[PDB]
Amino acid sequence: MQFRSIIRIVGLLLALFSVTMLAPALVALLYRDGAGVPFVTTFFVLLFCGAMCWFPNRRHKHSRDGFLIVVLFWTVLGSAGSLPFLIADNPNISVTDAFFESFSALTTTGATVIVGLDELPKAILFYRQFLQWFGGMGIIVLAVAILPVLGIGGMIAETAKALWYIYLSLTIACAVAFWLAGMTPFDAISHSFSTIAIGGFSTHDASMGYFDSYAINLITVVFLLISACNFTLHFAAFASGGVHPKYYWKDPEFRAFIFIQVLLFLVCFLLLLKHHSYTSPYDAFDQALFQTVSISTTAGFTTTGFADWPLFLPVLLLFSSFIGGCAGSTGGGMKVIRILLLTLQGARELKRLVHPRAVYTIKVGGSALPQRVVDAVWGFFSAYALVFVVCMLGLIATGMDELSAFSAVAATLNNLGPGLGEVALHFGDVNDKAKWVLIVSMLFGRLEIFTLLILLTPTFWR
Amino acid sequence: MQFRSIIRIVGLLLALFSVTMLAPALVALLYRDGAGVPFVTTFFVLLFCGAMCWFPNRRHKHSRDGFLIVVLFWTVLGSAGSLPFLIADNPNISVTDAFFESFSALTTTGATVIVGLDELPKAILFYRQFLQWFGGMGIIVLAVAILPVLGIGGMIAETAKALWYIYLSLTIACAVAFWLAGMTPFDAISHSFSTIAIGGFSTHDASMGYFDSYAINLITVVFLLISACNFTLHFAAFASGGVHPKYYWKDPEFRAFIFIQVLLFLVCFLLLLKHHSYTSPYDAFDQALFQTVSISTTAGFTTTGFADWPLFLPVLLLFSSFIGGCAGSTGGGMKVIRILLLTLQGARELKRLVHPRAVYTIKVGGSALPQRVVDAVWGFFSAYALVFVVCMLGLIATGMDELSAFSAVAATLNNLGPGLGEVALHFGDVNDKAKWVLIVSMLFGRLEIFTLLILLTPTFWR
Numbered sequence: 001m002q003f004r005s006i007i008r009i010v011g012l013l014l015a016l017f018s019v020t021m022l023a024p025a026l027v028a029l030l031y032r033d034g035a036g037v038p039f040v041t042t043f044f045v046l047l048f049c050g051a052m053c054w055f056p057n058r059r060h061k062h063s064r065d066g067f068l069i070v071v072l073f074w075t076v077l078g079s080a081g082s083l084p085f086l087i088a089d090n091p092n093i094s095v096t097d098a099f100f101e102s103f104s105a106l107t108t109t110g111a112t113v114i115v116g117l118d119e120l121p122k123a124i125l126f127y128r129q130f131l132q133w134f135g136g137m138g139i140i141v142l143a144v145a146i147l148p149v150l151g152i153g154g155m156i157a158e159t160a161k162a163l164w165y166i167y168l169s170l171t172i173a174c175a176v177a178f179w180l181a182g183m184t185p186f187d188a189i190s191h192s193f194s195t196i197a198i199g200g201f202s203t204h205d206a207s208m209g210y211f212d213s214y215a216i217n218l219i220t221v222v223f224l225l226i227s228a229c230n231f232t233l234h235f236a237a238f239a240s241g242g243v244h245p246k247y248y249w250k251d252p253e254f255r256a257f258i259f260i261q262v263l264l265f266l267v268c269f270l271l272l273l274k275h276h277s278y279t280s281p282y283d284a285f286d287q288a289l290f291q292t293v294s295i296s297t298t299a300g301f302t303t304t305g306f307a308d309w310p311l312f313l314p315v316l317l318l319f320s321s322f323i324g325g326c327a328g329s330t331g332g333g334m335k336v337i338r339i340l341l342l343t344l345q346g347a348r349e350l351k352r353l354v355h356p357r358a359v360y361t362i363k364v365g366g367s368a369l370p371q372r373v374v375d376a377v378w379g380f381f382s383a384y385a386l387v388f389v390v391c392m393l394g395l396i397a398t399g400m401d402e403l404s405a406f407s408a409v410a411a412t413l414n415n416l417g418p419g420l421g422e423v424a425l426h427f428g429d430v431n432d433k434a435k436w437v438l439i440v441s442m443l444f445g446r447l448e449i450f451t452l453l454i455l456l457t458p459t460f461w462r
Numbered sequence: 463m464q465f466r467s468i469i470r471i472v473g474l475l476l477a478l479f480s481v482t483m484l485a486p487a488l489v490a491l492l493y494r495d496g497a498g499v500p501f502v503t504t505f506f507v508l509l510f511c512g513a514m515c516w517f518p519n520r521r522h523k524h525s526r527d528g529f530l531i532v533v534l535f536w537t538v539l540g541s542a543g544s545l546p547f548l549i550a551d552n553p554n555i556s557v558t559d560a561f562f563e564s565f566s567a568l569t570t571t572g573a574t575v576i577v578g579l580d581e582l583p584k585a586i587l588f589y590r591q592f593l594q595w596f597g598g599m600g601i602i603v604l605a606v607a608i609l610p611v612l613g614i615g616g617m618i619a620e621t622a623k624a625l626w627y628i629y630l631s632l633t634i635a636c637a638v639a640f641w642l643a644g645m646t647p648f649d650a651i652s653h654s655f656s657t658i659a660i661g662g663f664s665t666h667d668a669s670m671g672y673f674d675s676y677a678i679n680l681i682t683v684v685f686l687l688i689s690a691c692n693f694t695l696h697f698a699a700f701a702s703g704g705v706h707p708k709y710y711w712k713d714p715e716f717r718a719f720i721f722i723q724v725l726l727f728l729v730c731f732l733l734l735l736k737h738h739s740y741t742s743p744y745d746a747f748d749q750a751l752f753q754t755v756s757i758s759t760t761a762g763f764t765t766t767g768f769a770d771w772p773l774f775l776p777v778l779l780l781f782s783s784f785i786g787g788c789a790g791s792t793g794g795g796m797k798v799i800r801i802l803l804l805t806l807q808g809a810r811e812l813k814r815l816v817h818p819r820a821v822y823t824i825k826v827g828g829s830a831l832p833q834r835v836v837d838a839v840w841g842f843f844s845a846y847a848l849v850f851v852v853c854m855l856g857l858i859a860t861g862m863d864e865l866s867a868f869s870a871v872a873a874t875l876n877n878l879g880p881g882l883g884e885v886a887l888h889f890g891d892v893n894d895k896a897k898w899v900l901i902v903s904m905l906f907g908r909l910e911i912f913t914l915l916i917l918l919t920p921t922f923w924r
């Protein structure tokens with residue numbers, strides 16, 4: 001087991017986290033407004049705690065450890081990251097609310113309990129976006145860095161930098177475009193933070209409701225679509241050539257993400273027209289395209305409130321939220337390939353009933369899928385259902401009413417952010433226990449459900 | 463394919479159905495009350511249509527036919543059985559309402575759209591119960607009769623009579639007991655019809671709310687539990703003497719059904735106590751014990767309205783509605799063995815993550831399950847979820863609101879069918895399209911989802 005060498009990495013990570021508190025404290029002296037005293041207190045207590053772990057250890061005793069690591073990386077960082085939200089009496093908020101905000105930020109869930117954030121320190125807002133960006137690193141270097149500790153192919157740090165490039169040259173390349181459709185520079189850095197990590201956080205209390213310019217809406221769209229799609233596939237970029245064209249339409253995962261996106265928008269738009277839910281058919285186009293792309297790819301950004309929207313639309317959207325993101329992106333539904341595979345496998349299951357003496361094989365690209373991963377997919381989907389209904393009961397038990405709890409889990413297990421059900425979105429004054437439960441829900445939502453469930457099976461130890 | 467020999471059995475069934483219209487027409491002349499003109503009109507149009515099918519055929523050209531038949535037996539009979547509810551202007555009701563009532567009746571769904579049935583002809587009420595009883599035959603002789611046409615073991619009419627005996631000596635043995643806790647004989651036969659076929663229909667508009675005597679509540683409980691339990695397992699009754707005892711606690715399906723029932727009751731009761739939802743700690747026991755068994759074993763009978771019940775309870779009940787009935791009984795959730803197996807399979811999936819080079823096998827009784835049935839189970843669960851969310855969308859689109867459509871599907875896909883969500887139960891005045899949707903929902907719910915799904919795959923033909 002050797003937790004003694006695991007704690008080395010934990011403390012090392014706390015120090016590495018401390019060196020990111022100097023990032024919105026450098027906005028606590030730049031932008032004149034508010035208080036950044038906490039951020040510099042935090043940079044201290046964290047560096048101290050972390051190094052108080054790293055130093056009494058120093059042992060690289062390089063399975064059961066890998067999981068425990070990728071649960072500590074969140075459980076600790078998302079806990080430590082609730083410290084600015086505590087000492088700071090600028091948005092003075094409850095400890096549980098602080099935790100909810102920190103975890104929701106770090107998970108790239110994006111569901112706030114701080115109302116009235118439009119008028120707060122330019123730092124405590126920047127921290128909010130920076131968290132999303134930073135966790136948005138984890139969620140994609142953990143689609144590579146796990147291999148040494150864990151198994152994807154158990155079911156190379158060449159790409160640790162090479163990914164950070166695709167990420168940086170995306171947030172920057174977005175910031176320019178955002179501030180070219182005219183946000184304040186601050187808002188265009190802090191909204192690329194949110195839009196690339198597919199998180200949903202904003203500076204405006206109405207998210208993407210500042211400037212109804214189809215410029216920013218239809219920018220957020222294309223940068224979401226880019227961000228919501230398989231950084232290893234993007235990796236056909238720095239790998240010299242810019243021979244992008246064919247690689248995307250090669251992989252059937254992406255091909256499916258595109259069919260899904262198209263169909264979903266199409267139906268949404270067409271119903272928004274049929275229903276006369278928008279004055280101009282153009283605004284219908286806008287709001288439809290932005291809402292489907294944002295909500296289904298696990299983004300969270302809202303440009304409307306579904307005022308004129310037929311209930312069928314926010315419901316079907318909250319459902320399509322279960323399928324968002326080429327696997328190994330910054331999204332976090334039961335990722336696209338999961339649904340692809342699922343439909344394939346079930347299709348088979350329907351075929352076998354007809355001719356049962358027949359040999360049907362699951363075909364993805366060319367090679368067949370093994371009956372060890374099909375089992376894994378099905379088991380995952382089931383587990384997902386379990387977790388969802390369990391936390392739905394947990395919320396109804398917390399005190400919450402039925403539909404609000406349904407929306408809540410459906411928003412924290414996919415890591416959405418919006419209530420999205422029947423305009424019951426706002427978490428601020430929800431039950432406290434509910435806040436904790438929902439935090440759990442988004443920890444599950446991040447760890448793809450299994451790598452936490454196994455933590456409490458006896459079989460894990462030892 | 464040869465549909466030509468299929469029509470023989472279809473018409474033969476319309477005639478066999480005609481000769482059961484003389485059964486509540488024999489109550490339209492016995493009990494002085496009401497109008498039985500329809501039942502004798504129906505006995506004619508049905509005998510005529512049926513024989514107009516059987517006669518121009520006569521060919522016993524003894525898979526895909528087995529399926530097409532076991533969809534015809536419901537789709538045809540449940541349509542034909544909507545004929546009394548049409549011509550009769552005593553509860554004069556819309557055609558779609560008539561179909562809803564007939565299909566819900568024959569399915570053992572148990573969800574009425576006729577409010578105020580307390581004051582109706584003693585025949586049209588008896589027809590309502592008789593339907594449930596007759597379908598309650600189908601749902602258990604199709605756990606035998608299918609084998610020649612189809613496959614359970616593709617994934618003997620010795621027992622065709624032998625089942626009808628365990629069924630008859632149960633409805634009779636219940637009718638007596640009901641009329642010994644003092645119902646009118648009519649109400650004690652027509653409630654054994656419903657309580658054995660696990661259907662949920664009643665004579666009283668408040669179902670089991672006539673006489674809050676724990677006598678009848680705790681009779682209905684004990685006859686539900688028996689009826690809700692594996693007639694093939696019961697078959698250890700007529701064969702040899704009363705050597706029942708060991709057989710039950712041998713089979714782990716039943717062994718699981720008992721744990722489930724107990725745990726469910728326990729939590730329910732204990733919460734009805736903690737919440738002070740009942741004046742005396744006796745009525746708490748009563749209502750808990752009756753409600754868990756009724757709602758979870760797919761019965762439908764209600765003795766309360768969940769006035770003081772903590773919301774957590776009707777919700778958890780509506781969910782436990784998904785798993786009800788020893789497999790091959792009169793229930794119709796995703797039957798108990800399914801959930802047992804599912805949990806086993808997922809537990810396994812959770813084990814493989816830890817030690818991945820290991821050989822884990824699924825164990826039920828003694829022999830392991832083959833990896834052709836685990837696949838089938840998982841596929842079934844997935845399909846189930848799919849169907850549910852699809853019909854929930856179909857209903858939210860029909861016009862219904864979100865939570866109501868949810869309760870509706872969750873009640874018709876398992877065949878409960880009380881609303882049960884947050885006191886929005888009553889189907890009578892729901893949208894008209896929605897009624898059709900719900901009929902589909904309960905056809906799926908009856909046919910275990912696959913054996914109708916495959917009917918619309920191209921692969922089925924030919």
Ligand SMILES: [K+]
Binds near residue numbers: 108110198300
């Ligand atoms: K999000």
Ligand SMILES: [K+]
Binds near residue numbers: 571662761
């Ligand atoms: K029922």
